[PDB]
């Protein structure tokens, strides 16, 4: 789709079984996910933007289906204010910015 | 243009006679700049972000050019990690994500 910026750009994503809502944002360099489970292996991270740092779990090679289009990745999970869909998945189901 | 997300998508930007790196945001509801000298009154706001919140100085009716596409809105200015270009003056210059 054409998704405008009138309004925050959320969609709903399937994750583990799972539906959210989630923001596309083209700010951010990973996806990172409020608490839930996952399969596989994972490791501590740390992330920052405003406002500091938070603490978040590592998960690689989670797919995930964004708006219908799927794809795999990495997924942070951890307290986020947002759920949020970073350029990580982004560039997978072909989003760009255009003007 | 198309700006595609396996990097970073930033610009340069003019605000106030001068050019600086910024990030096309879609996750920010608001444009904020690092500490910078601005006209006019300012009035407060809090933004949260991934860590917390940070205090900001909000500054209307800004001249502020992107990429060459020239918009007037809001400035927030303040701690922020990077500049960010958020939804209010993405919408002034057009921008849309596609999928
Ligand atoms: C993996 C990450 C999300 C870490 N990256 C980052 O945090 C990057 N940023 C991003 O990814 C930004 O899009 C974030 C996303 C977000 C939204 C709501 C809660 C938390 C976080 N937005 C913000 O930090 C604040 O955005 C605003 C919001 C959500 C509301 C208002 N009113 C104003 C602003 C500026 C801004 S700083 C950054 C480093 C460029």
Chains 1, 2 share one sequence.
Do not use: C
Request: proline share 6%; charged share 20%; hydrophobic share 40%.
């Amino acid at each position: 789709p054409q998704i405008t910026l009138w309004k925050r750009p959320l969609v709903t994503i399937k994750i583990g079984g799972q539906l959210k809502e989630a923001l596309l944002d083209t700010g951010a360099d990973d996806t990172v996910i409020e608490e839930m489970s996952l399969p596989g292996r994972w490791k501590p991270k740390m992330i920052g933007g405003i406002g500091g740092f938070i603490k978040v779990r590592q998960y690689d090679q989670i797919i995930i289906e964004i708006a219908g289009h799927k794809a795999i990745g990495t997924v942070l999970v951890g307290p986020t204010p947002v759920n949020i869909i970073g350029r990580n998945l982004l560039t997978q189901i072909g989003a760009t910015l255009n003007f």
